[PDB]
Amino acid sequence: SSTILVIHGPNLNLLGKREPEVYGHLTLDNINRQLIAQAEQASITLDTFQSNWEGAIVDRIHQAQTEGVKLIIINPAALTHTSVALRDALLGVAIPFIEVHLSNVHAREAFRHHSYLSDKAIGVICGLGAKGYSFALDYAIEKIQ
Amino acid sequence: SSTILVIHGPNLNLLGKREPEVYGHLTLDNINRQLIAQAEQASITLDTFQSNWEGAIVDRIHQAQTEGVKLIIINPAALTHTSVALRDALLGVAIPFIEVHLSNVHAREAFRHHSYLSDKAIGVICGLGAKGYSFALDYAIEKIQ
Amino acid sequence: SSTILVIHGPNLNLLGKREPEVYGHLTLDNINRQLIAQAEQASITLDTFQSNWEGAIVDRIHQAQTEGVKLIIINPAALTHTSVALRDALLGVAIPFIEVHLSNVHAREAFRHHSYLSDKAIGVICGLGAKGYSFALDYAIEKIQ
Amino acid sequence: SSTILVIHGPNLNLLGKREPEVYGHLTLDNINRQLIAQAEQASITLDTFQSNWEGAIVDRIHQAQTEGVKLIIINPAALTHTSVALRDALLGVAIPFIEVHLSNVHAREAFRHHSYLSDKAIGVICGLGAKGYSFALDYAIEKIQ
Amino acid sequence: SSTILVIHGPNLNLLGKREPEVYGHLTLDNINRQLIAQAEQASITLDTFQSNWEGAIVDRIHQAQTEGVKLIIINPAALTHTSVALRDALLGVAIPFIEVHLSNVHAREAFRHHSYLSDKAIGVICGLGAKGYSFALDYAIEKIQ
Amino acid sequence: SSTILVIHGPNLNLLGKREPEVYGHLTLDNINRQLIAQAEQASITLDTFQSNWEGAIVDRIHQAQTEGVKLIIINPAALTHTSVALRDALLGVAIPFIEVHLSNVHAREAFRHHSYLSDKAIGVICGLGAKGYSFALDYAIEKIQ
Amino acid sequence: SSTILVIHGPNLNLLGKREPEVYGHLTLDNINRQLIAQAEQASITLDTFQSNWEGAIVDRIHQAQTEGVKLIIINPAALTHTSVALRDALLGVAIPFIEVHLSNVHAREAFRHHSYLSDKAIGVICGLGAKGYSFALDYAIEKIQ
Amino acid sequence: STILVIHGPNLNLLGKREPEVYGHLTLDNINRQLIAQAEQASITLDTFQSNWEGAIVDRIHQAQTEGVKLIIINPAALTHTSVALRDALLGVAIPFIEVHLSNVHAREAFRHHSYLSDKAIGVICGLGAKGYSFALDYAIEKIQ
Amino acid sequence: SSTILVIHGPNLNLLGKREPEVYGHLTLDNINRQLIAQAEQASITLDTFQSNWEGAIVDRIHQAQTEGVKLIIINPAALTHTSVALRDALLGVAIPFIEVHLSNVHAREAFRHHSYLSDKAIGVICGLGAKGYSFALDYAIEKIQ
Amino acid sequence: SSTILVIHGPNLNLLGKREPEVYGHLTLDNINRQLIAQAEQASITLDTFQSNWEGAIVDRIHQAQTEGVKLIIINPAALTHTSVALRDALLGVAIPFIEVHLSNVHAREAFRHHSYLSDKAIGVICGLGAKGYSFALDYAIEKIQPSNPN
Amino acid sequence: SSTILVIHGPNLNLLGKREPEVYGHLTLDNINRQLIAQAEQASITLDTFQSNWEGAIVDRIHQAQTEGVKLIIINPAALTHTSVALRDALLGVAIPFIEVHLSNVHAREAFRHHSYLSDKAIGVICGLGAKGYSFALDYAIEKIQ
Amino acid sequence: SSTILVIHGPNLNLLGKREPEVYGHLTLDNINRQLIAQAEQASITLDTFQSNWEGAIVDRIHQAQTEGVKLIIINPAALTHTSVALRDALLGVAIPFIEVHLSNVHAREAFRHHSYLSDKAIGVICGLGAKGYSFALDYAIEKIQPSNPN
């Protein structure tokens, strides 16, 4: 009834385009399907977005507050280290959000440790991969029941 | 003949999207219109542009070289801390400018103190809200006349 | 035994002692029972350990390797910012761990943004209260089966 | 009426010497008159202070309190980057104020990019010559209308 | 059976769009056609792209993996200092690339020294204007064999 | 009826081991007794505790809460620069504390300047030798009124 | 032949102005009036001094030298973080001083953490208020005797 | 004269995942050859390992009263974090040499920093357990 | 038909106030007649001036533009690392200067390694004690003509 | 008076010394004779130089001033990160120069991202192996043409 | 021709040049001799080289490859902090090395804490005087078996 | 009896070489007879040295120690910012030195503000053109008779 919104940042789109071994066989779609499925099983709405354009997401988020979204679960991808606009969009709207990362952002380049969201997020999950999204949703469904 | 171009960076359109409590409550246009009125009365022809997509903001800056725009007023907001490409635009066409900010950026988080445009612009204003926008237009003019 | 060991860093024994507002009421042993139940519903063993003495924790972490623990869910608390011993213990025993925190670590003093653990954990959940422990228990159980 | 004090930092008493093509036409006098004339238009008894001395300005700020001054407009800046005594007086009397710089102060040497006032100041103006004060004073008045 | 994509980033379209000594006659398209012919002379196919938009360049390089582009010659421009997206875009597809800038990155402001791609390209060529492209292409032609 | 607690950190038990060479013949035992007598002669009860283990001090701090201690006069000594656990212990039991140091800390190494306790202590006495304990006691007694 | 000279930095003249607790009723004179009193019952003389000018306190400290002041109790206020002149003044005349701050300096802005005087004072009291002066004086009595 | 060898936390793990990560060598092994090195030089050397700082602190206070002359310490992890260990060492004022099995400089930067190094007589890192012997050979030559 | 002013910053008047050296009796007094003499012996005009008051020193150089002058030799002392008011005071009058210091700036505390006057001076001199002044003067004299 | 001088810095002699692939088989010798052959078709005279001592490179640069070398193509190697002396030399003689590196320098240790040279060069090439030099040449060879006339 | 090659950097040739307990009478020669003696005990062939010219050291490292040296014990002295060319010659010939220093570098000045050679050496010794070269040889000797 | 050694770093040999309007024709050679005549005038022995090779300079600082040079005036040039090797050369020989730079190093790139020498130098003089050497020699000259006494 009250919407959850899952936002995917740049390049998440490329997910799965070179299996066998690089996490071969997993795609941004495979992911959207589970989350959508998990959100359904506990009777809640879930919309997924994706663009390699920062202006496209800032847009979506301005719409999310308008579309009544209650809690955003964002995988800002590379934009989390560079976009304060991605931050002032999620704050300016005042929606709660939980930041999600597939990879352990802390285990990669140091410029990846900085984030423009995690501090205003309810929480942050990184490195649990796809399930990160799942748990993020788990906490979200309860967060406001 | 002349043209002033006020551009607004991301999220600025969200002005007034939840009014209580006693905050301020004004929109992106309450100023756009506050400016255009002030523009013509002094014989100069204004122009405004707003997006959350950096590309757009660049092309509008570019096309200004074709157009013959003499000076720009801009509030890149979030972009001032992040886009040099934006910087490359205003220098690429040799169109002077001014940078304005609604909130007093220096009283917020630290990261908001850096600016990729401030140093190039004729000047900067912040913490006075919309009154800076229009304080700027005032200078834009007394320069051309 | 399919042992997973839950470790709680110092001061966590005080959770729930000015009930109404500060942290509210969720006692260490309240979290312990919860984990034990989840642990048993999955037919997976789970001992727990708390101590205000860092060395008690490292002692426990070693004992865990001896005991064949497959993964540690550690809530180092104040030690995530100050303990390399803790990091090197977990890397010494090569027991993969998930770092978990109740409060959103990135929301407090900048000094709590650093972790001598995070970069080498599988992932990090923070700011999601006791559930953090549970999700961590989920990912963990599903990684062992 | 009700008083606004317009404090000037050290060096603004200088002038426009080597006046043609040094950018030194107008003097402090020419800014202090213009403004006091603008406070006349606002029906406020606006007094000014220029001192190359810190201790004269702080003392001034305390007199201002006892004299129930309502808001201070202050162009420290050779004092903006260096003094907290100035800051602690402007807070210790809790009279609101604004910061103004004739030149764009971010277009210069990197160490001008910091201020001990800007953060606890209502707003900041830099870059637009002495037009900047008139902007401050205007604003200050609407702050009393 | 080979293709070379050439990518021009933001503000590269302005070459020769300001006449006299400001980049003179040489247009982005003169560069394009010469390169096209140099390609053809040695029976290689070659395409060119340019956009002030981050997402667009991001998108088209993904199109490249689909189109079988054996190597990208790219002049990111101002996006080398901001976009970790493009870094994940080029890294994502895995199309070896060459960094080309016309001007000399290092003779400028400190933030230009920082590149999100430099450390991942085959090599960089900056400071040699148009000819920079010809060379990259020359090398790109011999690379494939 | 009121209990004041005085907690001495690691290495403080060493007071009086090389008497004339460094500091003086004064001990923890004197400071303690003179402290008790001053409190008996003021109708306050007072207990004391010293330890070289963060856990014990942490532990004691927790018991002071249950014992109804009204205030802790503490000398964390070295823990002050490294223990965010000690900090969280005092925070977790919310017993006002005054941080005392016999030696003047800022006179020493740069790292001794940082402290995880000073910003949460009611006040800090450092460098005035053992009187800083009497003064803390004295102050704590006026506070106990 | 003992005199004690108490110095009060800029703004301390403002103590006890909005007595309805922006901070309490205790005024600068009260402090001196209780200080001179305490001294006498020990047959010690004691003049005191306050000022908002860097120079005044400097000159003043210089006079203490010729006046044969045994010790100095000083509260530099903000000059503590900005004046190396006050520093070189105190080290210049070499009268040991007890740096006293009514407020726990460490609980405020980062720039207040710094101090150009602490590494050079016998000790520091900060955050214990006016009793801090008596304590300084009490310590200052017995050491001088 | 008594040397006292302190091993910080986790050193009790030496040789516990034998396949060429570490190797077969253990801490008791190191102590064994160390006490031996000591007895060969007619020096009493006591060892102490604890994953507990207070234990290590107390030990060095006891070391004062016992009359210990020099401490060879491998604070391991405690190097980059414990100024209490520093103050304890400084407090009883017993000279010490800092030891580290792996080249700390070829790892993570936070490794690079030591709260003891500047006050130790010297430092040895990257030469494996051999460092205790070197430090002990040095320790011994400072007492004889 | 020129003139030369010499400036001394705070604390200099303290020279030679604790008998044997560390400058045993080279007071500031001495250093002035010495510098004055040398100027009256090559026939140049010049006055000396020392103040523990910043504003006074700043004032004093504005009197430099009122009367004369071609070159200024200055030892700010403590105001070198602190004052940018003094810097712009020199640039504004535009009188080229020579920076001088009695002790070796570079050999003291790090904080003293920063000079606000160094990068604009004609040149700097430090560590040559008194004699340093002597050279500054000397370089000027053979520079006017 | 229309020479091009090519300068190789420290360790560049070692090209192809380990024949098997830590790099290929290419030596400085080959790069030069190719450069010289290339300068001949254009009727341009070119010289080359290499040394592992900063001073010697500083000297040869200074010597190019007197030879009337018109443009210097330089691969400074490790020196770009440490030698402000090499820097003040190319600026000393005011000979434009192109900086070339065989490997992509930004793809390694942080310190290796700094350069006391790149900013004052005409352009920089890095990563392209030997061909990086050819481009410098082909570019230089034109460069002699424009910037007339007289 | 030689199995192990010791390198002594600039200024190590100064050892013992000021003998009466401005350090030990121990020369660089004595150190070479001691090492050589020791190497003859393990039937290892050792060569020594010292110079104040980086190029001579680099050329030597190059000659070292073509000679087939197995390990380099190097005390680059000063050059540890500044030479990447030494780095590049050592890596370039791909010969492993142990780094050595006589004094505790960590006890001296901060700029001495940095090293262009430490991270690629097998190990480093410092503070144990000449004994440090011994320990390294003894270490090298064992490895070459 | 009290000899002064003047050391000029790399590139200083280029002085007086795009003559018509830049700097002067004033050569390093020229600056040297000025210092020589200044030293000779005060009864002080003065030597000079310049090399574009650091190792040549460290060597000479070492020779100065055995030469009994009471004080060194050095224009480390670009080396003041890079050679801690030069710094340790000076500290190890424990010869007091004065640092001279022709230009005002603080008015140039940020990297020119860090000196591996200055904090151990008695003093620094920069910006005063070639006369800085003169003022340094000046101090050096009176600095050889001060309170021991005498």
mmCIF file of N, CA, C and O in Angstrom, chain I residues 10-68:
data_model
loop_
_atom_site.group_PDB
_atom_site.id
_atom_site.type_symbol
_atom_site.label_atom_id
_atom_site.label_comp_id
_atom_site.label_asym_id
_atom_site.label_seq_id
_atom_site.Cartn_x
_atom_site.Cartn_y
_atom_site.Cartn_z
ATOM 1 N N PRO I 10 54.529 42.475 18.117
ATOM 2 C CA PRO I 10 54.397 42.269 19.559
ATOM 3 C C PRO I 10 55.554 41.548 20.219
ATOM 4 O O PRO I 10 56.262 40.777 19.587
ATOM 5 N N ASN I 11 55.723 41.858 21.503
ATOM 6 C CA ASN I 11 56.738 41.256 22.351
ATOM 7 C C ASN I 11 58.211 41.602 22.175
ATOM 8 O O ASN I 11 59.025 41.236 23.022
ATOM 9 N N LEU I 12 58.530 42.330 21.146
ATOM 10 C CA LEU I 12 59.882 42.703 20.890
ATOM 11 C C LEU I 12 60.446 43.625 21.981
ATOM 12 O O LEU I 12 61.609 43.544 22.359
ATOM 13 N N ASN I 13 59.600 44.502 22.488
ATOM 14 C CA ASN I 13 59.982 45.456 23.535
ATOM 15 C C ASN I 13 60.488 44.713 24.768
ATOM 16 O O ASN I 13 61.020 45.321 25.698
ATOM 17 N N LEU I 14 60.289 43.397 24.772
ATOM 18 C CA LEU I 14 60.718 42.551 25.878
ATOM 19 C C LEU I 14 62.175 42.131 25.775
ATOM 20 O O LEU I 14 62.697 41.493 26.688
ATOM 21 N N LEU I 15 62.826 42.469 24.669
ATOM 22 C CA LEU I 15 64.217 42.089 24.478
ATOM 23 C C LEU I 15 65.166 42.496 25.602
ATOM 24 O O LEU I 15 65.150 43.635 26.080
ATOM 25 N N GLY I 16 65.988 41.533 26.018
ATOM 26 C CA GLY I 16 66.951 41.758 27.078
ATOM 27 C C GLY I 16 66.348 42.175 28.406
ATOM 28 O O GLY I 16 66.776 43.167 28.987
ATOM 29 N N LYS I 17 65.368 41.417 28.901
ATOM 30 C CA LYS I 17 64.735 41.752 30.174
ATOM 31 C C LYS I 17 65.049 40.758 31.307
ATOM 32 O O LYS I 17 64.580 40.933 32.432
ATOM 33 N N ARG I 18 65.822 39.712 31.009
ATOM 34 C CA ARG I 18 66.234 38.746 32.033
ATOM 35 C C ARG I 18 67.749 38.534 31.928
ATOM 36 O O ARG I 18 68.234 37.427 31.655
ATOM 37 N N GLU I 19 68.465 39.640 32.137
ATOM 38 C CA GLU I 19 69.920 39.742 32.106
ATOM 39 C C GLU I 19 70.674 38.798 31.159
ATOM 40 O O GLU I 19 70.272 38.826 30.067
ATOM 41 N N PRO I 20 71.736 38.096 31.644
ATOM 42 C CA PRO I 20 72.412 37.231 30.691
ATOM 43 C C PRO I 20 71.626 36.391 29.757
ATOM 44 O O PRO I 20 70.417 36.112 29.926
ATOM 45 N N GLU I 21 72.294 36.097 28.662
ATOM 46 C CA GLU I 21 71.668 35.760 27.414
ATOM 47 C C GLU I 21 71.280 34.318 27.332
ATOM 48 O O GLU I 21 71.534 33.556 28.241
ATOM 49 N N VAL I 22 70.783 33.915 26.175
ATOM 50 C CA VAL I 22 69.639 34.412 25.431
ATOM 51 C C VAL I 22 69.435 35.918 25.229
ATOM 52 O O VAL I 22 68.496 36.494 25.734
ATOM 53 N N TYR I 23 70.359 36.537 24.511
ATOM 54 C CA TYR I 23 70.452 37.941 24.370
ATOM 55 C C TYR I 23 70.585 38.600 25.730
ATOM 56 O O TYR I 23 69.595 38.851 26.407
ATOM 57 N N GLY I 24 71.811 38.728 26.172
ATOM 58 C CA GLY I 24 72.063 39.393 27.406
ATOM 59 C C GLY I 24 72.286 40.840 27.123
ATOM 60 O O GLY I 24 73.418 41.258 26.940
ATOM 61 N N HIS I 25 71.198 41.593 27.154
ATOM 62 C CA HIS I 25 71.209 43.032 27.017
ATOM 63 C C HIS I 25 71.123 43.629 25.622
ATOM 64 O O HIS I 25 71.137 44.835 25.477
ATOM 65 N N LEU I 26 71.002 42.834 24.588
ATOM 66 C CA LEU I 26 70.661 43.464 23.366
ATOM 67 C C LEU I 26 69.206 43.684 23.568
ATOM 68 O O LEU I 26 68.384 42.841 23.343
ATOM 69 N N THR I 27 68.872 44.856 24.027
ATOM 70 C CA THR I 27 67.445 45.161 24.068
ATOM 71 C C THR I 27 66.965 45.682 22.713
ATOM 72 O O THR I 27 67.765 45.918 21.805
ATOM 73 N N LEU I 28 65.653 45.846 22.582
ATOM 74 C CA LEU I 28 65.056 46.347 21.348
ATOM 75 C C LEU I 28 65.580 47.767 21.171
ATOM 76 O O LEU I 28 65.935 48.184 20.065
ATOM 77 N N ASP I 29 65.626 48.484 22.295
ATOM 78 C CA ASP I 29 66.113 49.862 22.388
ATOM 79 C C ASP I 29 67.360 49.968 21.517
ATOM 80 O O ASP I 29 67.377 50.676 20.505
ATOM 81 N N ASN I 30 68.390 49.230 21.917
ATOM 82 C CA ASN I 30 69.666 49.172 21.209
ATOM 83 C C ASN I 30 69.455 49.005 19.697
ATOM 84 O O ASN I 30 69.832 49.867 18.906
ATOM 85 N N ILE I 31 68.840 47.892 19.309
ATOM 86 C CA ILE I 31 68.587 47.577 17.907
ATOM 87 C C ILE I 31 67.987 48.705 17.065
ATOM 88 O O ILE I 31 68.073 48.683 15.838
ATOM 89 N N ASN I 32 67.415 49.711 17.715
ATOM 90 C CA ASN I 32 66.800 50.811 16.984
ATOM 91 C C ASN I 32 67.765 51.936 16.638
ATOM 92 O O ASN I 32 67.833 52.374 15.482
ATOM 93 N N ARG I 33 68.500 52.417 17.634
ATOM 94 C CA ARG I 33 69.462 53.478 17.373
ATOM 95 C C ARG I 33 70.434 52.918 16.324
ATOM 96 O O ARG I 33 70.868 53.640 15.431
ATOM 97 N N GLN I 34 70.739 51.623 16.430
ATOM 98 C CA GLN I 34 71.653 50.947 15.500
ATOM 99 C C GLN I 34 71.152 51.015 14.076
ATOM 100 O O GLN I 34 71.895 51.344 13.153
ATOM 101 N N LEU I 35 69.877 50.696 13.908
ATOM 102 C CA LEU I 35 69.257 50.700 12.598
ATOM 103 C C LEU I 35 69.073 52.126 12.125
ATOM 104 O O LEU I 35 69.224 52.411 10.936
ATOM 105 N N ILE I 36 68.747 53.022 13.055
ATOM 106 C CA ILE I 36 68.561 54.439 12.727
ATOM 107 C C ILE I 36 69.894 55.015 12.249
ATOM 108 O O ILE I 36 69.978 55.627 11.181
ATOM 109 N N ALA I 37 70.930 54.811 13.053
ATOM 110 C CA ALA I 37 72.257 55.288 12.706
ATOM 111 C C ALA I 37 72.575 54.918 11.253
ATOM 112 O O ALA I 37 72.742 55.795 10.410
ATOM 113 N N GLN I 38 72.635 53.617 10.972
ATOM 114 C CA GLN I 38 72.926 53.105 9.633
ATOM 115 C C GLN I 38 72.161 53.808 8.514
ATOM 116 O O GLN I 38 72.642 53.899 7.385
ATOM 117 N N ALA I 39 70.962 54.289 8.819
ATOM 118 C CA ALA I 39 70.140 54.983 7.833
ATOM 119 C C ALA I 39 70.573 56.447 7.725
ATOM 120 O O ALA I 39 70.511 57.049 6.658
ATOM 121 N N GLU I 40 71.006 57.013 8.845
ATOM 122 C CA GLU I 40 71.458 58.394 8.863
ATOM 123 C C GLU I 40 72.897 58.465 8.341
ATOM 124 O O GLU I 40 73.420 59.548 8.095
ATOM 125 N N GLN I 41 73.522 57.304 8.147
ATOM 126 C CA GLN I 41 74.900 57.255 7.655
ATOM 127 C C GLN I 41 75.071 56.972 6.163
ATOM 128 O O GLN I 41 76.191 56.838 5.686
ATOM 129 N N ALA I 42 73.968 56.864 5.433
ATOM 130 C CA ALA I 42 74.013 56.618 3.991
ATOM 131 C C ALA I 42 72.991 57.585 3.445
ATOM 132 O O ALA I 42 72.587 57.521 2.288
ATOM 133 N N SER I 43 72.573 58.470 4.345
ATOM 134 C CA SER I 43 71.610 59.512 4.072
ATOM 135 C C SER I 43 70.266 59.031 3.516
ATOM 136 O O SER I 43 69.987 59.173 2.326
ATOM 137 N N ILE I 44 69.482 58.387 4.363
ATOM 138 C CA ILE I 44 68.119 57.996 4.042
ATOM 139 C C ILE I 44 67.227 58.326 5.232
ATOM 140 O O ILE I 44 67.699 58.400 6.360
ATOM 141 N N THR I 45 65.942 58.544 4.978
ATOM 142 C CA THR I 45 65.005 58.846 6.049
ATOM 143 C C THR I 45 64.412 57.539 6.577
ATOM 144 O O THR I 45 64.229 56.589 5.818
ATOM 145 N N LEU I 46 64.111 57.489 7.874
ATOM 146 C CA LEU I 46 63.571 56.268 8.456
ATOM 147 C C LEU I 46 63.150 56.378 9.915
ATOM 148 O O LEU I 46 63.817 57.039 10.704
ATOM 149 N N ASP I 47 62.041 55.738 10.277
ATOM 150 C CA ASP I 47 61.623 55.741 11.672
ATOM 151 C C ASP I 47 61.378 54.301 12.088
ATOM 152 O O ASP I 47 61.133 53.445 11.244
ATOM 153 N N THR I 48 61.469 54.033 13.385
ATOM 154 C CA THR I 48 61.239 52.696 13.902
ATOM 155 C C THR I 48 59.929 52.724 14.663
ATOM 156 O O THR I 48 59.432 53.791 15.000
ATOM 157 N N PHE I 49 59.370 51.554 14.934
ATOM 158 C CA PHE I 49 58.123 51.472 15.681
ATOM 159 C C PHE I 49 57.805 50.056 16.134
ATOM 160 O O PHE I 49 57.857 49.114 15.342
ATOM 161 N N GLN I 50 57.450 49.921 17.406
ATOM 162 C CA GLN I 50 57.111 48.625 17.980
ATOM 163 C C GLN I 50 55.855 48.739 18.835
ATOM 164 O O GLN I 50 55.702 49.684 19.611
ATOM 165 N N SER I 51 54.959 47.771 18.685
ATOM 166 C CA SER I 51 53.732 47.754 19.457
ATOM 167 C C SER I 51 53.253 46.343 19.734
ATOM 168 O O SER I 51 53.380 45.457 18.888
ATOM 169 N N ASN I 52 52.707 46.144 20.931
ATOM 170 C CA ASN I 52 52.157 44.852 21.321
ATOM 171 C C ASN I 52 50.722 44.835 20.813
ATOM 172 O O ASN I 52 49.968 43.900 21.080
ATOM 173 N N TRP I 53 50.348 45.884 20.090
ATOM 174 C CA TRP I 53 48.991 45.996 19.570
ATOM 175 C C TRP I 53 48.959 45.867 18.050
ATOM 176 O O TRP I 53 49.571 46.669 17.331
ATOM 177 N N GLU I 54 48.253 44.856 17.557
ATOM 178 C CA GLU I 54 48.168 44.656 16.125
ATOM 179 C C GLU I 54 47.712 45.927 15.432
ATOM 180 O O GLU I 54 48.470 46.530 14.687
ATOM 181 N N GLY I 55 46.475 46.336 15.702
ATOM 182 C CA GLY I 55 45.903 47.521 15.079
ATOM 183 C C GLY I 55 46.829 48.713 14.997
ATOM 184 O O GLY I 55 46.762 49.489 14.037
ATOM 185 N N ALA I 56 47.680 48.864 16.007
ATOM 186 C CA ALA I 56 48.638 49.961 16.039
ATOM 187 C C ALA I 56 49.639 49.773 14.906
ATOM 188 O O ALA I 56 49.890 50.688 14.123
ATOM 189 N N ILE I 57 50.215 48.579 14.827
ATOM 190 C CA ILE I 57 51.171 48.280 13.777
ATOM 191 C C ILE I 57 50.538 48.497 12.404
ATOM 192 O O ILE I 57 51.136 49.134 11.532
ATOM 193 N N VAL I 58 49.328 47.971 12.207
ATOM 194 C CA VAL I 58 48.635 48.131 10.924
ATOM 195 C C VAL I 58 48.445 49.613 10.645
ATOM 196 O O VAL I 58 48.734 50.084 9.550
ATOM 197 N N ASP I 59 47.942 50.333 11.643
ATOM 198 C CA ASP I 59 47.733 51.766 11.521
ATOM 199 C C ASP I 59 49.029 52.344 11.028
ATOM 200 O O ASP I 59 49.121 52.912 9.944
ATOM 201 N N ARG I 60 50.039 52.158 11.870
ATOM 202 C CA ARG I 60 51.377 52.650 11.630
ATOM 203 C C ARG I 60 51.884 52.500 10.198
ATOM 204 O O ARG I 60 52.631 53.361 9.746
ATOM 205 N N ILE I 61 51.495 51.455 9.469
ATOM 206 C CA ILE I 61 51.977 51.370 8.093
ATOM 207 C C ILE I 61 51.060 52.127 7.137
ATOM 208 O O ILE I 61 51.394 52.347 5.974
ATOM 209 N N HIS I 62 49.893 52.527 7.611
ATOM 210 C CA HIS I 62 49.017 53.301 6.741
ATOM 211 C C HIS I 62 49.557 54.727 6.774
ATOM 212 O O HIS I 62 49.453 55.476 5.796
ATOM 213 N N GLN I 63 50.188 55.065 7.897
ATOM 214 C CA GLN I 63 50.830 56.362 8.081
ATOM 215 C C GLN I 63 52.011 56.348 7.119
ATOM 216 O O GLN I 63 52.502 57.393 6.695
ATOM 217 N N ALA I 64 52.467 55.145 6.786
ATOM 218 C CA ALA I 64 53.518 54.976 5.794
ATOM 219 C C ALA I 64 53.021 55.474 4.443
ATOM 220 O O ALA I 64 53.755 56.121 3.699
ATOM 221 N N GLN I 65 51.871 55.085 3.991
ATOM 222 C CA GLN I 65 51.448 55.709 2.775
ATOM 223 C C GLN I 65 51.187 57.249 2.982
ATOM 224 O O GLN I 65 51.497 58.021 2.103
ATOM 225 N N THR I 66 50.636 57.699 4.121
ATOM 226 C CA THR I 66 50.456 59.136 4.305
ATOM 227 C C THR I 66 51.760 59.912 4.147
ATOM 228 O O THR I 66 51.787 60.975 3.526
ATOM 229 N N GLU I 67 52.839 59.377 4.710
ATOM 230 C CA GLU I 67 54.143 60.022 4.614
ATOM 231 C C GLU I 67 55.169 59.101 3.963
ATOM 232 O O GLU I 67 55.551 58.083 4.441
ATOM 233 N N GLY I 68 55.837 59.605 2.932
ATOM 234 C CA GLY I 68 56.825 58.823 2.204
ATOM 235 C C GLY I 68 56.019 57.859 1.413
ATOM 236 O O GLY I 68 54.991 58.308 0.909
#
